[PDB]
Scaffold this active site. Structure first.
Site, PDB file in Angstrom:
ATOM      1  N   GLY G  30       1.214  -1.882  -0.036  1.00 17.41           N
ATOM      2  CA  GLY G  30      -0.017  -0.179   0.464  1.00 17.41           C
ATOM      3  C   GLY G  30       0.604   1.749  -0.141  1.00 17.41           C
ATOM      4  O   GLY G  30       0.379   2.500  -0.395  1.00 17.41           O
ATOM      5  N   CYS G 239     -26.611  -7.664 -20.428  1.00 21.92           N
ATOM      6  CA  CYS G 239     -25.941  -7.314 -21.472  1.00 21.92           C
ATOM      7  C   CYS G 239     -26.888  -7.053 -23.073  1.00 21.92           C
ATOM      8  O   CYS G 239     -26.997  -8.353 -23.598  1.00 21.92           O
ATOM      9  CB  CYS G 239     -24.029  -7.962 -21.358  1.00 21.92           C
ATOM     10  SG  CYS G 239     -24.023  -8.103 -22.972  1.00 21.92           S
ATOM     11  N   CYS G 242     -24.645 -10.915 -24.477  1.00 21.25           N
ATOM     12  CA  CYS G 242     -24.522 -12.272 -23.555  1.00 21.25           C
ATOM     13  C   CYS G 242     -25.801 -12.258 -22.794  1.00 21.25           C
ATOM     14  O   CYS G 242     -26.509 -13.297 -22.431  1.00 21.25           O
ATOM     15  CB  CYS G 242     -23.653 -12.799 -22.718  1.00 21.25           C
ATOM     16  SG  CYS G 242     -23.027 -11.051 -21.604  1.00 21.25           S
ATOM     17  N   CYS G 264     -20.677  -5.883 -21.472  1.00 17.55           N
ATOM     18  CA  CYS G 264     -19.857  -6.183 -20.555  1.00 17.55           C
ATOM     19  C   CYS G 264     -18.825  -5.543 -20.955  1.00 17.55           C
ATOM     20  O   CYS G 264     -18.124  -5.477 -21.708  1.00 17.55           O
ATOM     21  CB  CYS G 264     -19.891  -7.252 -20.372  1.00 17.55           C
ATOM     22  SG  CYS G 264     -21.400  -8.823 -19.732  1.00 17.55           S
ATOM     23  N   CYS G 270     -17.462 -12.041 -21.383  1.00 12.35           N
ATOM     24  CA  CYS G 270     -18.375 -11.395 -22.404  1.00 12.35           C
ATOM     25  C   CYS G 270     -18.543 -12.936 -23.685  1.00 12.35           C
ATOM     26  O   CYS G 270     -19.480 -13.462 -23.505  1.00 12.35           O
ATOM     27  CB  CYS G 270     -18.512  -9.974 -23.224  1.00 12.35           C
ATOM     28  SG  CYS G 270     -20.086  -9.930 -23.762  1.00 12.35           S
TER      29      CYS G 270
HETATM   30 ZN   LIG Z   1     -22.122  -9.248 -22.389  1.00 12.74          ZN
END
Ligand SMILES: [Zn+2]
Ligand SMILES: O=P(O)(O)OC[C@H]1O[C@@H]2OP(=O)(O)O[C@@H]2[C@@H]1O
Ligand SMILES: [Zn+2]
Ligand SMILES: [Zn+2]
Ligand SMILES: [Zn+2]
Lengths: 144, 279, 353, 193, 353, 145, 276
Positions: G30, G239, G242, G264, G270
């Site tokens: 970090g 989406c 898909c 996506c 996707c």
């Molecule tokens: Zn998608």
């Protein structure tokens, strides 16, 4: 006081031409088993200039600088630093640097390699100076 | 005598426009007349305006004298004179009294000019107020209204800061009692030679596209204060060649040690003094 | 006693001989041809054509060869050659709508009529030196597609018919010609554009980049970049009708530079225009941005930065004037410097002793 | 038919300009323009030389009605291509004879304080460059003083002696008589003695 | 700002192929080699070397060839290539007193110890296009003279030994390196000089021209111009002594500027400084002039011209930044403009119903 | 020979490459006698461009223009104005214009000289346009970042 | 190895320095480890910090996956992938499954990151509190002082100014329970994915030249309030390709009239869903 002589012949090698140096070194027919401890590497050298030519330092760009190192059989180390990117030239310069530290090659190569190269460079420099001084502007001349 | 180019290298339209500009300048002594300057074989700021003025004026019967820094042997003078010889094929002389057209950069000849001689000046900055006021949009109005008080303020500030007027060359003049005109970058030493001269004075600013002139026998008065009069450059040494003491001298550093020699900028006058015994 | 002698002409002739020897370079290499510079150094040729004022690729390549690659020197060579030639005619105003497009892109609209066309460009390339160019080679065989070109109306035509822009309509005014008369500030837009097309590309690019500081991150958009061949035609008096004298490769940039709200008028996108010879896309965009910046007086704006200062920008934009008047310091000035020396010596002798 | 022009346009124009410059920079000096052997009548030799050496497309020319002939207009717009205007105020080179009137003289362009060279030049044809009122000239171009007695119209004499248009405004006058030419710029002080 | 774009791989590759085929030009002509470009277009290589930042002739010529003669693209290529190299050493400060002079002039005196050595220079040439260069020929034979270089002391040494100027003394301050840390304004003079050496030539030329015309005048005199070969030296860690690695052809300009009246010191001249690779000297002169202009805070003189503005001059002199800025505006900003369209349309409705 | 046809053949001649025009004309071998009224002169043409492409005019620099005029034995004046400096090309274009002004050569040259040159130019345009279209693009943007 | 260039286009000195900085950052999770490299000009904005890390850590045997906003079809992603193909010759893949190096801009892949993977994030700004503290002198020390309450101010006032936490991008986190780090402008949807990830995450900022890494299986928690726990708004839209709505959806514009669609962001996931 070998530092001054080493500087002189190193500068004569670096200021030489790769063609001239390679041809002369091949003609010498001189070679000793050496190993490239440092492979010829081409990087940068930072250019440092002075304000007004004499004042504080400032950075004025970079140039290309190639460096190589070679170790001879007896352990003598020869280094090179030549402006440009010709790595074979740097390797040859390092080899000559190593050889010039051996008592067998110092005088021989100084008589046959370094002095002739310096003479050739001086000859071409003088010719260029003549051509340039042809452009001088004359104003006054002494008269008796 | 031209090698392809028109006589004087300029077409007739360009020379006609420059001639109209010259006539207007002579009719308005000291005023900067704009003109459609063309790009010449010499770079801007190397005498293109003077070249164009000479090309417009010069004729086949003229003897042209080109001097820079007072000498005919200067590189720029050599180039300009050779160009004019190529494009006009006129007579060229180094004697001022023998010349008809004299093109000068930063020097008025020591020899006084006669009645029929025209002297042409190369001017980088036609505007005498340019350094006080960089913008032309303001200086044009300042000249229109005759608001020259800022130049006097500049001289006053020079006096206050240094006790002397800082301007040494291109010293502003008053022409015909009306127009504050910038002379060439001549030394103030030459300023008195412009007063009531019997020769025509032309001023060409080729890069800045300005032409102005001072007619013969025209009042020319360098600016100054009553308690701080106008004074000219003076050297404690005579000329190292002709022993002269009234010519604008210049330094020629001889060696690195610091040995100097003062010799006349006006080389023709120097030769005249040397051949005619010595001063 | 140091008699003055002549060494000036023999100095400059030797200097010029040395300069030409330097130009020819090593003689073991073939002397590069003007045609090679025209065909392979085509962007340098485009810049020299644009700034020198003559759209003649062979002349620009010759100027580059004679100038030892010095672009400013070649520009001044071409500009001085302009004076040699006579104005035979004046073409009809160019019609960029009839361009034969080598390249056509827009950063505002995806579906522009005629289609996007990247054409030959350095955009999207990696700035990696092609060391294979250290030796001989040949470019890849070019891919081919449909051979037909659809009509390509201007993007700003779409923007104007949508009310978002104002159509640039000719009022019949006579353009100003700085080559005939000296500039007189303030200048009309025609004079400003003519001067800008002759302006040094580095200076104009820097001015355009400086205009970015005026606003935040909302940069302008390249409304349309259009590079291709425009037909040049003239109306000779021997005939009276138009004759198609040839074609020129030109690049036209129309920049969308944000919208303003003129009083008693609906707000619309302001536009900048740049027109260059050849494929000088960067120069055209810089010209458009500087043109928009210099449009300040007619938009009722305040000059915030040098780029919007008309006199400062235009007086120094010309490459030939700046180069000449900076290089002229190499001229002798010992008469003027002596006048300075005398004053300083007098000042030193009074300040102290 | 058209009136011919300079036999050697370049050399003749150069010589004519040099004579005119001599006359202009030294007011009151009479110079002869012997390069054109026949002026465009009614225009005399000097007026025709001035027009041929200074007029072109950029300079509108106004010809006074007595001198406003047809063949002269044809030859002027053919040899010089100078625009031919109908009003005095639109002219760069005004041409007139003794019949000039005060209205025409005052209509001409005197320039502007910021552009004093944007005015007009009055090419006046006089009966003679001598025998008129004796005039004393002082100013730039005159060493100490000059005396000239051209036969000037009353309006032009008033203009010269009083200068209603302050410097740098004013018209540069070119008096012509046959082959001879005299010039009075706007900066010349003229008194009637 | 940054609009993500998809679906151009094939078109982008085709565009790059077109660009490379156009760079090669007509294959009937030979391919413009890199040795030819560096030998015969030496001034373009000088500018590209100076601005890019690598003093390698061949690399700059290769970058010029790749960019089809474009100097800004070549500078970009060389600057990017500088990233792949390792910093092997830092040289000893250059000693220009040891320069092997190809050219040396001084405008402040008629003659000086060493002489006015014109050398190779286009000065005093009549810029008339040479059409014999459209075919092959032969370079002129070089007349020879005394093959010796006389002591050429710097003119500023002469001026300082008279007390008319001050020697530039070395305080030992460590130079700033913009190539490691971005500049922060106001920046020391070393940083200013480093940035000036990398600035666009055509923009610093215009700034210097503006100062000359009166926008921040510094009363410049070309005190000295030198062009010649300077030995570069390093002190390697492997060794302990300085070694000489070669020589660089460089141009140095020392300007004599207006004198000042210090409160407790004799009046003296000020001075600018310029230093560039190769023999392109107008860049060095402009560098010296802008250096003097930016020395305003050192001399406590308030800026009256844009060239005296440090942020304006230095923030836009870099070609790479301005070129990248202008190139971004070309990228598809379809979404961002759609936002502007909505913003503009609302203004149109509110101010026009 | 209407005005449009003369304009067409003059444009075709002007756009024809000098080498192809010379080669095709020599192959034609139809050579006559003509008097050069105006010797091929190379000067400049001042380029007028429009603001935004459709607005007020400005001067977008200049281009070289080589003009020539020719006369035939029967008094037919031919002319040509072509960008460039090839004087021979300009006088040849003027010659062909003069020849095509008369029915003796008009139809023959239009059918076997002007048409092949125009077809060659169209073929070159089509090939270049096809290889350029190979770089036609369709970019899809994404919102946000 | 591109002719005339070093492997991965970077000089070995910059590589070595960045590698040392990466090791220090790993040893200090970090923490924005400074490194003093040079200035390198690049055409595409993305790369000042990400390309440097990739060049420092990429090898000949790696498989590279370049991602811009989750997508591999992006022009910049394709350009960077081609650049690394030219200067390294590595293989490139469209699948997070088969990739060994994943260079991403502002997005973690939907597919879980497995062992022996490194994911590199371009970081325009490496310190989130640059929007509040102008001077950096206090910024460095307050990390040791642990004064991380100042950055809580924007989170506290976000609800007051808008009624809900709208900081869906560059949402600050606390890694290892000690160091407050700000990832690249990744969405709030991906912030949970950083919790004890099997892979080594590297973050590199170029314009600031700061590097910070998250060692695999490192505890990073979103910074929030107990009364206002860190929650990610569930997506209620599918989406367009898909259909599955289990992945962060980005917007693609189809016309000039404003028409658009949701797809996506991670095109790899996707495609995996579509081919199912
Ligand atoms: Zn998608
Ligand atoms: O613009 P131009 O072409 O008329 O140049 C006139 C003058 O400008 C420069 O400045 P300078 O006086 O030192 O000498 C040069 C030249 O003689
Ligand atoms: Zn003397
Ligand atoms: Zn000067
Ligand atoms: Zn953007």
């Amino acid at each position: 006081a070998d530092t001054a002589t080493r500087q002189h012949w190193m500068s004569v090698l670096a200021h030489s031409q790769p063609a001239e140096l390679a041809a002369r070194l091949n003609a010498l027919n001189i070679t000793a088993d050496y190993e490239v401890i440092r492979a010829a590497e081409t990087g940068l050298v930072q250019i440092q200039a002075r304000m007004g030519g004499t004042g504080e330092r400032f950075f004025a760009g970079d140039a290309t600088l190639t460096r190589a190192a070679v170790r001879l059989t007896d352990g003598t180390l020869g280094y090179s630093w030549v402006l440009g990117r010709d790595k074979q030239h740097a390797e040859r310069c390092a080899l000559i640097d190593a050889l010039m530290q051996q008592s067998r090659h110092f005088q021989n190569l100084s008589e046959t390699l370094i002095a002739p190269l310096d003479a050739d460079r001086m000859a071409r420099i003088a010719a260029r100076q003549a051509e340039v001084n042809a452009s001088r502007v004359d104003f006054f001349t002494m008269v008796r | 005598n031209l090698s392809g180019y028109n006589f004087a290298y300029l077409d007739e339209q360009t020379k006609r426009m420059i001639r109209r500009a010259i006539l207007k300048a002579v009719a308005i002594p000291g005023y900067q007349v704009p003109f459609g300057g063309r790009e010449m074989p010499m770079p801007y700021g190397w005498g293109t305006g003077g070249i164009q003025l000479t090309a417009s004026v010069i004729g086949e019967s003229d003897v042209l004298k080109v001097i820079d820094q007072g000498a005919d042997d200067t590189t720029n003078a050599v180039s300009i004179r050779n160009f004019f010889k190529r494009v006009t094929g006129v007579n060229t002389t180094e004697r001022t009294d023998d010349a008809t057209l004299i093109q000068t950069r930063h020097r008025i000849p020591e020899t006084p000019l006669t009645e029929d001689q025209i002297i042409i000046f190369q001017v980088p900055i036609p505007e005498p107020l340019r350094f006080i006021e960089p913008r032309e949009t303001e200086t044009r109005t300042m000249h229109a209204l005759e608001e020259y008080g800022v130049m006097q303020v500049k001289l006053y500030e020079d006096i206050a800061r240094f006790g002397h007027i800082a301007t040494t060359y291109a010293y502003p003049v008053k022409v015909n009692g009306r127009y504050v005109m910038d002379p060439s970058p001549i030394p103030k030493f030459d300023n008195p030679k412009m007063d009531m001269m019997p020769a025509l004075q032309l001023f060409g600013a080729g890069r800045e596209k300005r032409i102005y002139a001072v007619p013969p026998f025209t009042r020319v008065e360098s600016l100054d204060f009553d308690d701080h009069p106008f004074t000219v450059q003076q050297w404690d040494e005579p000329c190292a060649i002709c022993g002269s003491t009234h010519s604008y001298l210049d330094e020629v550093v001889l060696d690195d040690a610091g040995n100097r020699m003062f010799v006349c900028s006006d080389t023709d006058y120097c030769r005249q003094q040397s051949e005619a015994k010595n001063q | 006693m140091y008699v003055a002698v002549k060494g000036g002409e023999k100095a400059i002739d030797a200097a010029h001989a040395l300069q030409e020897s330097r130009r020819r370079g090593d003689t073991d290499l073939p002397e590069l041809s003007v045609a090679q510079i025209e065909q392979q150094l085509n962007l340098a040729v485009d810049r020299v054509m644009t700034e020198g004022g003559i759209a003649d690729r062979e002349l620009a390549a010759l100027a580059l060869k004679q100038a030892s690659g010095d672009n400013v020197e070649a520009i001044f060579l071409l500009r001085a050659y302009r004076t040699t030639l006579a104005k035979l005619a004046v073409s009809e105003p160019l019609d960029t709508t009839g361009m034969r497009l080598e390249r056509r892109i827009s950063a505002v609209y995806k579906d522009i009529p005629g289609g996007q066309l990247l054409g030959p460009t350095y955009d999207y390339t990696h700035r990696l030196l092609d060391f294979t160019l250290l030796a001989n080679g040949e470019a890849p065989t070019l891919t081919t597609a449909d051979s037909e070109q659809q009509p390509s109306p201007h993007v700003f035509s779409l923007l104007a018919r949508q009310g978002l822009a104002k159509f640039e309509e000719d009022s019949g005014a006579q353009p100003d010609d700085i080559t005939r008369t000296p500039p007189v500030y303030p200048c009309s837009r025609s004079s400003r554009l003519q001067q800008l097309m002759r302006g040094d590309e580095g200076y104009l690019l820097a001015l355009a980049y400086s205009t970015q500081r005026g606003y935040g991150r909302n940069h302008p958009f390249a409304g349309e970049i259009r590079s291709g061949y425009i037909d040049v035609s003239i109306v000779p008096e021997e005939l009276g009708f138009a004759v198609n004298v040839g074609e020129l490769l030109m690049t036209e940039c129309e920049m969308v530079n944000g919208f303003i709200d003129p009083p008693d008028e609906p707000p619309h996108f302001t536009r900048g225009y740049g027109l260059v010879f050849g494929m000088s896309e960067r120069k055209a965009m810089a010209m458009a941005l500087v043109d928009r910046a210099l449009q300040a007086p007619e938009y009722g704006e305040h000059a915030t930065g040098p780029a919007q200062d008309e006199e400062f920008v235009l007086a120094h934009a010309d490459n030939v004037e700046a180069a000449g008047f900076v290089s002229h310091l190499k001229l002798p000035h010992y008469v003027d410097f002596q006048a300075e020396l005398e004053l300083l010596k007098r000042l030193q002798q009074e300040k102290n002793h | 038919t058209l009136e011919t022009a300079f036999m050697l346009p370049v050399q003749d124009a150069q010589h004519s300009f040099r004579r005119l410059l001599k006359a202009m920079s030294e007011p009151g000096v009479i110079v002869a323009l012997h390069q054109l052997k026949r002026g465009w009548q009614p225009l005399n030799i000097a007026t025709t030389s001035v027009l041929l050496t200074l007029a072109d497309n950029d300079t509108p020319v106004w010809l006074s009605t007595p001198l406003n002939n047809d063949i002269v207009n044809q030859s002027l717009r053919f040899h010089t291509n100078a625009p031919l205007v109908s009003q005095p105020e639109q002219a760069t080179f005004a041409v007139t004879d003794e019949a000039i009137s005060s209205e025409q003289l005052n209509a001409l362009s005197t320039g502007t304080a910021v552009a004093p060279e944007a005015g007009a030049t009055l090419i006046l044809q006089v009966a003679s460059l001598s025998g008129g009122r004796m005039l004393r000239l002082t100013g730039a171009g005159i060493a100490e003083e000059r005396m000239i007695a051209p036969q000037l119209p009353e309006c032009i004499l008033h203009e010269l002696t009083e200068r209603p248009h302050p410097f740098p405004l004013g018209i540069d006058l070119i008096l012509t008589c046959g082959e001879r030419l005299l010039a009075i710029p706007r900066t010349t002080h003229v008194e009637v003695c």
